[PDB]
Amino acid sequence: AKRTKKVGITGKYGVRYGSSLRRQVKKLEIQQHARYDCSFCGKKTVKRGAAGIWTCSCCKKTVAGGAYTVSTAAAATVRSTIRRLREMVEA
Amino acid sequence: SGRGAPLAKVVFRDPYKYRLREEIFIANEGVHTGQFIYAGKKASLNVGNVLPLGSVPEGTIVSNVEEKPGDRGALARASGNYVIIIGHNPDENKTRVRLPSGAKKVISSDARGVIGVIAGGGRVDKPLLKAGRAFHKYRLKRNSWPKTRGVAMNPVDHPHGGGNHQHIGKASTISRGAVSGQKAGLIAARRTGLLRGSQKTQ
Amino acid sequence: PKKRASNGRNKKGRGHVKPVRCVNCSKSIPKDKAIKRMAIRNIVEAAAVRDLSEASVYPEYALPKTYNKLHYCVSCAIHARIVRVRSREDRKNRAPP
Amino acid sequence: VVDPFTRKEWFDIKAPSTFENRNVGKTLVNKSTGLKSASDALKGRVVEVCLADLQGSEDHSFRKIKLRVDEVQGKNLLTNFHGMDFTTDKLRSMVRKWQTLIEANVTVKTSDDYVLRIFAIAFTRKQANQVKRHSYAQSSHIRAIRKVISEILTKEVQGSTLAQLTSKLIPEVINKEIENATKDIFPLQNIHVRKVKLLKQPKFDVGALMAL
Amino acid sequence: MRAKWRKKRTRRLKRKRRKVRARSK
Amino acid sequence: SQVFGVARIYASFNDTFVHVTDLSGKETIARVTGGMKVKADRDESSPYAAMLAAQDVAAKCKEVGITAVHVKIRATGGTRTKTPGPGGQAALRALARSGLRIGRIEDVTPVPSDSTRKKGGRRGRRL
Amino acid sequence: SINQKLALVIKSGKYTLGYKSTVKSLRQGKSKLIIIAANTPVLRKSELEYYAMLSKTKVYYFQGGNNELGTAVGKLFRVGVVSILEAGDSDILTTLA
RNA sequence: AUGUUU
RNA sequence: GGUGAAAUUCUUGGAUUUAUUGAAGACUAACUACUGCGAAAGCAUUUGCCAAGGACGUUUUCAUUAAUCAAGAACGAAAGUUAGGGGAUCGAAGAUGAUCAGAUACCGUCGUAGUCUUAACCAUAAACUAUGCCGACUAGGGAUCGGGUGGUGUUUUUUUAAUGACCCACUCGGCACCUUACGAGAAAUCAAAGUCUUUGGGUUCUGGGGGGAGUAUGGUCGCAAGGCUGAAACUUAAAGGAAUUG
Ligand SMILES: [K+]
Ligand SMILES: [K+]
Ligand SMILES: [K+]
Ligand SMILES: [K+]
Ligand SMILES: [Mg+2]
Ligand SMILES: [Mg+2]
Ligand SMILES: [Mg+2]
Ligand SMILES: [Mg+2]
Ligand SMILES: [Mg+2]
Numbered sequence A: 001a002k003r004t005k006k007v008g009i010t011g012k013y014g015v016r017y018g019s020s021l022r023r024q025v026k027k028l029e030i031q032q033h034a035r036y037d038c039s040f041c042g043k044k045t046v047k048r049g050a051a052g053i054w055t056c057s058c059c060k061k062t063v064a065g066g067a068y069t070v071s072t073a074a075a076a077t078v079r080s081t082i083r084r085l086r087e088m089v090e091a
Numbered sequence B: 001s002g003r004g005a006p007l008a009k010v011v012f013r014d015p016y017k018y019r020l021r022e023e024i025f026i027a028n029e030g031v032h033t034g035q036f037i038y039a040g041k042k043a044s045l046n047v048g049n050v051l052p053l054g055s056v057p058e059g060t061i062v063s064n065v066e067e068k069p070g071d072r073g074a075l076a077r078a079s080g081n082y083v084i085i086i087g088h089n090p091d092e093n094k095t096r097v098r099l100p101s102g103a104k105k106v107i108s109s110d111a112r113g114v115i116g117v118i119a120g121g122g123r124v125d126k127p128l129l130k131a132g133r134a135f136h137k138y139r140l141k142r143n144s145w146p147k148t149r150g151v152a153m154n155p156v157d158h159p160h161g162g163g164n165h166q167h168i169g170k171a172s173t174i175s176r177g178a179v180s181g182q183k184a185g186l187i188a189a190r191r192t193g194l195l196r197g198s199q200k201t202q
Numbered sequence C: 001p002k003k004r005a006s007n008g009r010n011k012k013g014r015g016h017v018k019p020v021r022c023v024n025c026s027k028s029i030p031k032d033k034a035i036k037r038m039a040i041r042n043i044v045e046a047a048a049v050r051d052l053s054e055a056s057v058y059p060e061y062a063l064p065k066t067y068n069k070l071h072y073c074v075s076c077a078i079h080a081r082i083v084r085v086r087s088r089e090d091r092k093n094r095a096p097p
Numbered sequence D: 001v002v003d004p005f006t007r008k009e010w011f012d013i014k015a016p017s018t019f020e021n022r023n024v025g026k027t028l029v030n031k032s033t034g035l036k037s038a039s040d041a042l043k044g045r046v047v048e049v050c051l052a053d054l055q056g057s058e059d060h061s062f063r064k065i066k067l068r069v070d071e072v073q074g075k076n077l078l079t080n081f082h083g084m085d086f087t088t089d090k091l092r093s094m095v096r097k098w099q100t101l102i103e104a105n106v107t108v109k110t111s112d113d114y115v116l117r118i119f120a121i122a123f124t125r126k127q128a129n130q131v132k133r134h135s136y137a138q139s140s141h142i143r144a145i146r147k148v149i150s151e152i153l154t155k156e157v158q159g160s161t162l163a164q165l166t167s168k169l170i171p172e173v174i175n176k177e178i179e180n181a182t183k184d185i186f187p188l189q190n191i192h193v194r195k196v197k198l199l200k201q202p203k204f205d206v207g208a209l210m211a212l
Numbered sequence E: 001m002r003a004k005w006r007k008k009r010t011r012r013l014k015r016k017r018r019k020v021r022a023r024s025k
Numbered sequence F: 001s002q003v004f005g006v007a008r009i010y011a012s013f014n015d016t017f018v019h020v021t022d023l024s025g026k027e028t029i030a031r032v033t034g035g036m037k038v039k040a041d042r043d044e045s046s047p048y049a050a051m052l053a054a055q056d057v058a059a060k061c062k063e064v065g066i067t068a069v070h071v072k073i074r075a076t077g078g079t080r081t082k083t084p085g086p087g088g089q090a091a092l093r094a095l096a097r098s099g100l101r102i103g104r105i106e107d108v109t110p111v112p113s114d115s116t117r118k119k120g121g122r123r124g125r126r127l
Numbered sequence G: 001s002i003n004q005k006l007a008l009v010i011k012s013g014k015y016t017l018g019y020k021s022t023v024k025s026l027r028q029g030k031s032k033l034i035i036i037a038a039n040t041p042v043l044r045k046s047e048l049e050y051y052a053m054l055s056k057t058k059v060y061y062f063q064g065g066n067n068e069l070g071t072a073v074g075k076l077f078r079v080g081v082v083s084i085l086e087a088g089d090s091d092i093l094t095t096l097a
Numbered sequence H: 001a002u003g004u005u006u
Numbered sequence I: 001g002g003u004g005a006a007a008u009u010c011u012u013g014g015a016u017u018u019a020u021u022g023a024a025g026a027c028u029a030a031c032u033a034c035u036g037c038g039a040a041a042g043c044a045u046u047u048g049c050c051a052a053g054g055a056c057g058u059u060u061u062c063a064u065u066a067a068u069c070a071a072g073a074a075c076g077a078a079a080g081u082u083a084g085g086g087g088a089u090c091g092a093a094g095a096u097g098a099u100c101a102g103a104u105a106c107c108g109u110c111g112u113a114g115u116c117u118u119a120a121c122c123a124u125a126a127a128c129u130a131u132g133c134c135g136a137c138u139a140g141g142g143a144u145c146g147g148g149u150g151g152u153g154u155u156u157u158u159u160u161a162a163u164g165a166c167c168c169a170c171u172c173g174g175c176a177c178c179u180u181a182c183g184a185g186a187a188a189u190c191a192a193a194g195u196c197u198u199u200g201g202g203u204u205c206u207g208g209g210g211g212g213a214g215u216a217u218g219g220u221c222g223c224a225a226g227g228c229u230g231a232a233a234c235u236u237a238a239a240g241g242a243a244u245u246g
């Protein structure tokens, strides 16, 4: 069954710290404990070590990422921007 | 430990002696193990490569930027931070860059930076939620926590101490020319109060 | 009742038309509703076409025109008499004079 | 009680080596002194002269030309091409209702080093027997016409120097090239190269400047 | 009174009533 | 066989500038405005003040050595009016009639590509 | 498209899925074409290219990853490399390059 | 430009 | 500078104006229309990529798979909320100048939130054509957008021919428009608001004099603002619609 209506993973915090703080924590906790797709082996086996470290349990490859998600929007934008700059300067 | 951004141990060959040289870089986002990092004037514009600031086009995002050529990294080292190349001055060779704080700086065009953004970004977006988590954060940085308010002390302990109510008593904005023991509060504050309006003055 | 067969605007098949600002008072009007007049006045009418042609260093100068599309709100157009109140049947006439 | 014009001297602006006429006019500046040379206050000035007064013929009354002073040579400010724009009168006269306006712009480097942005314009037109009263294009015609114009300007630049492009702009041969390459898409009455913009200059190269 | 301002005044009244009912228990 | 300046008439409402400069525009000669030649605070844009200011500008111009002027006339433009104020025509007529020669009149009013949301609010000035 | 040709091969012809069977077919000389997923590791890609040049076999680089390649060949699992043994009635072997 | 009420 | 006229304001520390530059954010003029697309809200610089869509054409295919839809879902202007970024402009609040009898309004000068963007909410507008959707039929006409067909067609060149643009005629679909109304309507007006006392093609939603009142209460959604649902007591002979003459 569904055990909690809305607190989800933040049920461990009980009634403490405030609902809005528990929500802000819930979003990033789900992000940080999710399993992500390995961009090298194609499996859904990438999990976080410490903040910013994302290791695939298969193929043993670890990539630097965001503190709570494998890729921040800033870093994806920076990746696309640097790709564009490289391609423009080289051609 | 004590750092938000992860480090990358990058092994180069020693160009003058047969051996390996391990280096401790701050990992940029997207850098992975087994990746070939290229460092030098002629390295390609790829995330994780180390380039001189002059060799990158305007708008490039770099990290661990040298303030002076060869100081091995001073700027945009914290998690999620980066420097933006906003232009070059080829004569009197220099690069104008935007620092994380919003400041514009002119650096030698020979100073190096790492392509990309420091990994670990978004870290401060999670509420600590707990004195215990603040405790464990500063346990690996320094003894600066917890902080007793000076207004909760006695006059002997702090400028803000004393009084039959807790209150500063005098303006908390302290002159830049004040001396040690006086510089508690808002040192050399240009202004106070809730920031309303836009930043980046001209 | 409904005063105008379509509306006091020109919008059928659209839903939303981006607004323009009245040149006289800055009121926002939908572009299709605004009263639009073109002005092609001579850059020098000024009673002084002859004087300017005399002072000109160029023979047959062909002095230019100033072009300006003016957008009036209904209130401003009526007040400045770019447009006038018409009879119930005269309103049903879309030709210019 | 100073009369600032008692200490100002005149220089003659010699714009081209190529337009028709070297002398475009005069400009005044403070007499050179201890810590403020007159050449420093000159050598940056841009003048905007009508191409009709540059070429001598009144069929260039639009298309003003910007010329910036590159060097001071003995009371003679030798300038070079700095940009071209149409006049507001001509542009507003060309922009009319009941027709489709088509604009293209490209950024391209001249053969030597000059980075330019070229703004070409064109307008649809009625045919001779046309009864329909607006002659609008279908925006696929507009895309194709803009592609053709962009290619034409990109290949006109990159094969000419700044001087040769400036000498191509006066006959308006690029207008006719666009007309001939677009006449099978849409009639395109009023093709023009409405603007040339200097975005970045090369190293000064006084050797190349000194041709006038 | 204008219907818009009647609605606004009524909404302000409703807010005050909610606040009074909240303070009571 | 002459000396050309630029007339740079800025004919707003509430004022008219007659500002003659060298061909470059950096060096200026005899910038006179209608508020200099009238003291009523409401005749600053009037054609009479414009004519007096243009006459003063023409005198200083052919005292400095300017004989002809290329004319650049403008309104406030930007986002505000786009229509040349009442003083511009009078200023240019006075410049023509004060002995100066005239060349290449052009309207250089700043016109946006639909920028800069206009002042006044969406209901405009309610007078 | 390439996915259509692949589906037709899977339905009609003969094929092997996976690195080991693909290398076996290449060394036996009964591979007509090998399709390598985009995210296949470069070492394995180079080994397959060497085997394919030794066997004079054509190589097609599938633009998707192993997930996309498995989906294209109609399997619910990842496929890093496909080997075509017999095209059946499908023009995948001639509509290349 | 301002000019309330019956 | 600004206005009807002023004043606040800036200004010989050179304001305003001029020229040459640079930065930032927003916006996308003119072209722009009784023109287009989208379920609506909406959508207007170029190019690239990604999927989608209507109409048309079709001697392609399936063969009733359909229409409308309580419950239930997706989207949903602006304002507003939360958290980052951004913050040029304009600008709820606020501050001030002036009018004024008062003017904490209109007008002037600033100016916070907001305006912009990302990630989430909110779910409301005169969200309007105040006109549900599907189907059929009943006048005439000329324009116009998209597609198609035909022509001794005009112009455009490649070498026959050709697309393209245009002209003419037809056609399907669309935004509309003009005239007349057999007909409808209280009328204004309406090709649908017609084919309705000669009253039945299918189907969903809504209303039952004016207030009290979209109020109270309960439920539910929402962070909140609020949304959805929603009375009664009591009161009242009119309220209201269209049109006519003053
Ligand atoms: K404390
Ligand atoms: K104290
Ligand atoms: K004035
Ligand atoms: K702002
Ligand atoms: Mg603290
Ligand atoms: Mg104590
Ligand atoms: Mg003390
Ligand atoms: Mg003290
Ligand atoms: Mg105490």
Ligand SMILES: [Mg+2]
Pocket: C001
């Ligand atoms: Mg009425």
Ligand SMILES: [Mg+2]
Pocket: C015, C016
């Ligand atoms: Mg609407």
Ligand SMILES: [Mg+2]
Pocket: C075, F127
């Ligand atoms: Mg009025």
Ligand SMILES: [Mg+2]
Pocket: F127, I106
């Ligand atoms: Mg009033």
Ligand SMILES: [Mg+2]
Pocket: H006
């Ligand atoms: Mg009475």
Ligand SMILES: [Mg+2]
Pocket: F014, F015, F035, F041, F044, I001
């Ligand atoms: Mg004034």
Ligand SMILES: [Mg+2]
Pocket: I028, I045
């Ligand atoms: Mg545009």
Ligand SMILES: [Mg+2]
Pocket: I035, I036
């Ligand atoms: Mg269109």
Ligand SMILES: [Mg+2]
Pocket: none
């Ligand atoms: Mg429902």
Ligand SMILES: [Mg+2]
Pocket: none
């Ligand atoms: Mg919105």
Ligand SMILES: [Mg+2]
Pocket: none
């Ligand atoms: Mg409603």
Ligand SMILES: [Mg+2]
Pocket: none
């Ligand atoms: Mg309704």
Ligand SMILES: [Mg+2]
Pocket: none
């Ligand atoms: Mg009732």
Ligand SMILES: [Mg+2]
Pocket: none
């Ligand atoms: Mg009535």
Ligand SMILES: [Zn+2]
Pocket: A038, A039, A040, A041, A042, A043, A045, A056, A057, A058, A059, A060, A061
């Ligand atoms: Zn892996």
Ligand SMILES: [Zn+2]
Pocket: C022, C023, C024, C025, C026, C027, C072, C073, C074, C075, C076, C077, F124
């Ligand atoms: Zn108006």
